[PDB]
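request received
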Amino acid sequence: QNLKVLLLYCAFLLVMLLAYASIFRYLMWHLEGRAYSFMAGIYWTITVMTTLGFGDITFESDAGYLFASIVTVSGVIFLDIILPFGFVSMFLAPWIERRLRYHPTIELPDDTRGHILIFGIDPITRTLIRKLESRNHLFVVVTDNYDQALHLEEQEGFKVVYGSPTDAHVLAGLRVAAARSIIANLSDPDNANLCLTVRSLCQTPIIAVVKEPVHGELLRLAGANQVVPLTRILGRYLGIRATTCGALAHILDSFGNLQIAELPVHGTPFAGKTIGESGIRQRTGLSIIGVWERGSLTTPQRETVLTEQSLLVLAGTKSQLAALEYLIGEAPEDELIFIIGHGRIGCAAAAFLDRKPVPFILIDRQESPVCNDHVVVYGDATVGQTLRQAGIDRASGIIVTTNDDSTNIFLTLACRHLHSHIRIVARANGEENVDQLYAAGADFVVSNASVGANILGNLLEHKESAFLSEGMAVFRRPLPPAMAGKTIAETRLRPLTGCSIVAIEAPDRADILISPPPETILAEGARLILIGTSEQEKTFDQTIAAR
Amino acid sequence: QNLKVLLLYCAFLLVMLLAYASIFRYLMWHLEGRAYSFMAGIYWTITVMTTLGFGDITFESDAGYLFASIVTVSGVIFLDIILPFGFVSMFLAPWIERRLRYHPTIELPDDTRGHILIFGIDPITRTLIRKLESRNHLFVVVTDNYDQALHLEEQEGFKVVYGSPTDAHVLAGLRVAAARSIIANLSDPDNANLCLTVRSLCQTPIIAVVKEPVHGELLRLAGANQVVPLTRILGRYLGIRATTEDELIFIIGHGRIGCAAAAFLDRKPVPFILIDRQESPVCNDHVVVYGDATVGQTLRQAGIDRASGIIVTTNDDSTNIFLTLACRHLHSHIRIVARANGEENVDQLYAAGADFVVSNASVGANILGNLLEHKE
Amino acid sequence: QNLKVLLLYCAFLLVMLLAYASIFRYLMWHLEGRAYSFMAGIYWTITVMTTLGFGDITFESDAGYLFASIVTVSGVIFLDIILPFGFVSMFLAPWIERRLRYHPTIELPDDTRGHILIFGIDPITRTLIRKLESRNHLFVVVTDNYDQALHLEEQEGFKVVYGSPTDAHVLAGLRVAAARSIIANLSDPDNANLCLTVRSLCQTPIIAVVKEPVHGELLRLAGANQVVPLTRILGRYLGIRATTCGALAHILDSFGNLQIAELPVHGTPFAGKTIGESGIRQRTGLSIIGVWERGSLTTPQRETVLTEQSLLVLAGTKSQLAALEYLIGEAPEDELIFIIGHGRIGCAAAAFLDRKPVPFILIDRQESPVCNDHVVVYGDATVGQTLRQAGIDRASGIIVTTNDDSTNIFLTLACRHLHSHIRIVARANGEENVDQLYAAGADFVVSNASVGANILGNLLEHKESAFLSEGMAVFRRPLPPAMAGKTIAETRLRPLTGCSIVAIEAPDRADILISPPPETILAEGARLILIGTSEQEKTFDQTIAAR
Amino acid sequence: QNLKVLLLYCAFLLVMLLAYASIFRYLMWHLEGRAYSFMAGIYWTITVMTTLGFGDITFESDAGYLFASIVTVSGVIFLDIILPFGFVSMFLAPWIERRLRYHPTIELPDDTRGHILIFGIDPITRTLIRKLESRNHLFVVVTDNYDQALHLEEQEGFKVVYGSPTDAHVLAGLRVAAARSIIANLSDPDNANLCLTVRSLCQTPIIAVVKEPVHGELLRLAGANQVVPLTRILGRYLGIRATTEDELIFIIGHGRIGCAAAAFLDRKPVPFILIDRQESPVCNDHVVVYGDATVGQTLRQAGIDRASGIIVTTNDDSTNIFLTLACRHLHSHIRIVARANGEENVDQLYAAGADFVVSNASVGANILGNLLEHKE
Ligand SMILES: Nc1ncnc2c1ncn2[C@@H]1O[C@H](COP(=O)(O)OP(=O)(O)O)[C@@H](O)[C@H]1O
Ligand SMILES: Nc1ncnc2c1ncn2[C@@H]1O[C@H](COP(=O)(O)OP(=O)(O)O)[C@@H](O)[C@H]1O
Ligand SMILES: Nc1ncnc2c1ncn2[C@@H]1O[C@H](COP(=O)(O)OP(=O)(O)O)[C@@H](O)[C@H]1O
Ligand SMILES: Nc1ncnc2c1ncn2[C@@H]1O[C@H](COP(=O)(O)OP(=O)(O)O)[C@@H](O)[C@H]1O
Ligand SMILES: OC[C@H]1O[C@H](O)[C@H](O)[C@@H](O)[C@@H]1O
Ligand SMILES: OC[C@H]1O[C@H](O)[C@H](O)[C@@H](O)[C@@H]1O
Ligand SMILES: [Ca+2]
Ligand SMILES: [Ca+2]
Ligand SMILES: [Ca+2]
Ligand SMILES: [Ca+2]
Ligand SMILES: [K+]
Ligand SMILES: [K+]
Ligand SMILES: [K+]
Ligand SMILES: [K+]
Ligand SMILES: [K+]
Ligand SMILES: [Zn+2]
Ligand SMILES: [Zn+2]
Ligand SMILES: [Zn+2]
Ligand SMILES: [Zn+2]
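response:
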């Protein structure tokens, strides 16, 4: 806006120069009978407006004096007054204001399209923003907290809009209809308010982070396209790690046709072994769709070594998972898990361990305001003897799940020093503490920030097939001998059936190809894993038989 | 003010020009025997004070040199020093004390007349201002809270004054005597203070919004012209909608309004159940079940199944929406009457499953509006 | 500092002008054989430094060119660079800093003498400062609260120093030794800390406002020259006003020789009557040393009318006060005083009423943290029925003493409307509410702010005879017939005895002259009231008999 | 940095001058057949770019006019626009971001070496810095509290960094690897976090101040080189002074230090009485009389009459002074040992009536000082 005003002024200046130069020649002629060239006219007019004033060309008439004077004042006005004033008002004042006084962004420009609206800032969403700023996605966080909007604009890896997240006028200004996605990370009541409100304007996909798993149905009702029970998921993860030996954890039941389950490898026979050596696919009929270790979901190779901290992601039928549990097989007796911290996550961990069930003890300094189902040992786990008196000694595992990382580090530090034998699973509230938790002696660390972001991020990047894969089922099919040699693009499975190929695995290998390219040549006896509607899964073996 | 001093300066300049032009001609004549025209004196003086310096017209005498030096230094003092120092001191300084450091208005212009003072800004009064904008009144809201004065400075269809509502010196700079009307929407003790204070200065009509209907008489006594028991009115509105045996009405929220609702259902009578997360500080005529309506089995363990009606009356609209959603989810047909604290939430309450929605802001503003128009 | 730097620059500029002018003439001569005058030299040098450049006087030599150039650059540097920069750095930058950013005054300049140090800001001291700013006394308030020091510098009717009030380094910077007086209005422990600390530096008189009357001796021990029990005094004042009829309140016992007592006139026979009509001096032998009414301690005239709100200040012997109490004389039965608010002042009021004693009831919403001696009826006096249930009906008086003026107004409003008969005494925390308390129906209002300031102010203005009148006694003497006609300055009572004349009263009048001028002619039979040491009160009748 | 750009500009100017002076001579010659000296070219160019404009040397040709116009516009662009815009943009802007809006230091210069990091500023560490100033170390204190960073910016004999003490990215910009020593004076859990974090970057020696002596072992385990149990030391100091039957010692204040004092008197043994206004959150081996030592009969109703010694150990120095005064007032000769939290109060405690005064700041600093010098 300002460079235009700047150089539009330069246009006016230039036109003024020509005009005065032209009139200068006109007057020198008609008033004094002197002829000057165009260059002389420019030269004189510059000399005067610029106040150099050589004096080698002057008028002698009064009318020439009046004109010289007019041109002279014009220079003083348009080079010594307007120009610096224009500068101090179009450049300096705006900058000094924005740099001395926070001016809240109330509204998003009309043209904004395909942006990600973030409602409710916290470690999870802060980590999300940093993780997808590495992709340079357009993130707008929205807050109704003035002191917060300030703080977020100074280290702005993101634009901030200050406004009530539940006003439709605000949402309109945020251009929610034009938005790509929306993360709803407010309280459950505010989220409910937000979804209903956004839904009154648009059909933009909303991802809600629910604080109490029972409110999930309620938030879908309000209009959330996806609901993520973080504290439950986080508790579940502190849970599967706390047992002395690893154990299956069912993730998705895709109609009873295909199950997805995860298995931590600690304490299991598979620990220390390589994948093909453990022979899981051969003995279970399961598919290993990935090895999550060190924060990276990698694809399974035969020579890939499973460590105590590894976690297998598995897919197969209900009976194939039962075979795996037999191979493990039987849990050790007198398992006793101390869960320090009885907030939402601590509660979630205990609730997961009760699903099995595994004997646990909850400790917290205060009584839960939300839970009435769990008996808790009240005490400060930091003040001496409190853990001892709770029977920390006959414990086989400690989950340390406090809202404070330093306390978690300190507890992990102490427990591992007094009980070098037992399993220690620690909660990291920020990723800046994960390493020290390990250094303190924790066997595994669950990092809320990254886990939360990994989920939300994947729901975001796989959005184009998220609400597609929502209501749809993932299934597995033995590659029919008819296509033993043909390529994916040649078979044309999608325009006939409507399903997609998300995995191919070899008949006698633990090696699987994830999301195969259309030029992939299909081998004989191979096993396909597909995803599609519950009307395309039945119209598969039908349509594939017809053509 | 800035224009006058600036153009008063231009006048002094213009005088100084004519002065120097004339002295120039006078000296040129008497000192050097040269005759120059009036236009030549202007042109020369402009030429020298502007530092152009053509040099085509110069004195040759010492006295002419001395004069020329004086006019040169004048141009510098008055165009290159004072004029720019003028700019900065005169109107770059107002820009700092009004744009870099927030300066709240502590007084209205002496001649302010016909304005409606607002004491106690809230959804109701904010809705009132944004409702009567087509009549174009000058609404002035008054707060003694700096941060609130600051936030109300940008969100505007109204002016903000900052000072103690109960200070007579503050009300005078507010020009109460010349105001059209006062809306007193502070606490009952504060309103009483305000009325008595205003009544010591003037007879400006006051509309007081009262929290406890028993205090209505006291507020009229302090000097309020009208008294509006909004919470009683709002509660009566909810109770009316909850009905028009085995009839049982669940009233979630036992604040002042939910209380008014139950006070209403007492007269019918229709049996009800009050739930609140707190013991009431002002009431002890009603039996309340304590608990957070949001947490869990709280509503079930209060017996919300054999209820025939539900009134949602929390001071928080998102809570209201959430409860409405949850109740409509559990029981597809049970009559739900819901409270909207701000009119921004009215539609989501309906979308949540409510059968009728009482809109506090809209109801308050209408009463207050119809009181501002009909009384004045 | 800056105007000196400003015009010292103008000196350098001027010297530069002369120098260049002189050299200009020197060079025109020796380099070109041209002679110019001094005026021509000034004229040329100004023309060039100022960049006018007429061109009617130029050099032709190269050395003349070099010189013209040097002078030219000098003007650009010293009129176009230095001068505006010097301005933007000595004028603009300091102002913009002080006006955009609060710079705390850490220290008082060395030369500061005779200033009043204020430690502990509140309504009392805020009122004090405004009351003695009308005298233009030098007030420095000291605070260790940053956010407060800011707030006080914007509406500065006073300089603010930001610092720990108990650091001797701070006190040294405050120049406590050079100070006139010091008001110690911190907590009792901080005050104790302050006195001891100040006393380690100087002997500057300290006035301490004690929060708990029992700590008074403790604070004198620490070094306070004067101790003021505000809450006790304030309670006492709500107390003497709450009874249905006025009653003597003893103030000072000057060794048993002379007592000072105050008497509110409400309910007494003296109400409605004029002073000489009530004939108090004649019937009691007392002196009426003043009539406090409407915030003004006036002198008593015979025709002065006593109203229900008046308060007599009285002086005389123990027996003369007993005579007055008989004249009153006997209090009405079934007195019942409701005291709403049981903080320090409320407690003080009850404690005063117990000195008599008068039956009272204390009401408060919380239990006192400091008092264990008073039985209190717990309740919110605002929520309905609470007062009724307390038996507010058989009350003869209500003291309303809450920390909140609006609540006091509202209570006063309600009580007077439900009980138009009973005595209502209200507490005003700020003077901006005193009038409305009266308008609400209060019979008398005690204004903490003004009362506090009136006391502190008088201890300050009478400082030159405060620590003098501290340890000294005030006494009254019948004017001996020997001086029946002589003038004060002629008697020479001070250089003989050492006492002072602070009052003269006529033999058959209620008219008294306060602080008589030395030219006063003494009448026959008159009664003198004097003040002096307990060694000059005995060496009075001795020295006055000898000469 | 500002000097270089500024004087690099002067160089460009000087080049431009010589350039224009030479072109001037060249054009004057080839275009007009006039020969001018080098000095004449400087003088002319200075005359034109500076807008003086003597006019004694002017071209007569169009090409000479065009050139003169170019040099004139150059003077304006480079002396009346860029140079002043240079001033403001180059060093009037740093003045706003460093003097009108506080900018905390979030990182130390890359080459910072030999500095002592302070984590947890308090009277002890503040006394430590102001004590070792004669050795002239570069003390850097680190806070994660903005307002505290701000206040510590003015009160200085030390530098202030602002960031999370337990962030590895923050400790790296703090150049821990090249630091002389670290004083860890946060809470026990925070100290543990800090040690482990520092130990992942470097082997810089750490002196941790520990609150609960049982946690000493844990802190060494986390990586602290020395562990200092100050509160135990301070309490032992008080208990030593309270003594060197019917001996009974009143210990006012049952925080960590007063506890340490009583833990000390247990070993002798000398019977004592603890008074505190609160139940201890960390202790339950000692019996405590609850009450505020200041309020009233509290000390008498605890039996402070038959006490033979009194230890004042409150976290507040004015409270300590006040109690000492009151105790010395009641009993003229009873041994009183008093705690000074900051050394500013040591003398008033003595003036209050104390027999011995333990100065936390002075004792802490000496230990920490003698640990900084002797270990390094
Ligand atoms: N030292 C401690 N000992 C026992 N419990 C603690 C301690 N410190 C914190 N806690 C508890 O840990 C819980 C924190 O969990 P919270 O953040 O509130 O929910 P969530 O479990 O989902 O993270 C709190 O309830 C808190 O009381
Ligand atoms: N989740 C909740 N469950 C039960 N009561 C609630 C809940 N949230 C708010 N409330 C109650 O709503 C009341 C607010 O009262 P108020 O705004 O004065 O009028 P109303 O009668 O409409 O509730 C409070 O007493 C508060 O305790
Ligand atoms: N509505 C009320 N009903 C009863 N007591 C009240 C009410 N409001 C305030 N109070 C009490 O009045 C007392 C205020 O006195 P406070 O300022 O604390 O000491 P002081 O008596 O010296 O002024 C408080 O203890 C407070 O509890
Ligand atoms: N007026 C008081 N009466 C009794 N105890 C007090 C009083 N003021 C402070 N305290 C106590 O002093 C204690 C402070 O403990 P701390 O600073 O950790 O070390 P210390 O052992 O020296 O007291 C607190 O427990 C606090 O309750
Ligand atoms: O510059 C003025 C000019 O005006 C006309 O065009 C004349 O023809 C020309 O001779 C003259 O030079
Ligand atoms: O201005 C220069 C002057 O120098 C000497 O003083 C000469 O005597 C004088 O003739 C000349 O005018
Ligand atoms: Ca860390
Ligand atoms: Ca809404
Ligand atoms: Ca008032
Ligand atoms: Ca001190
Ligand atoms: K010329
Ligand atoms: K010229
Ligand atoms: K010029
Ligand atoms: K010029
Ligand atoms: K010129
Ligand atoms: Zn639970
Ligand atoms: Zn009720
Ligand atoms: Zn009491
Ligand atoms: Zn202990």
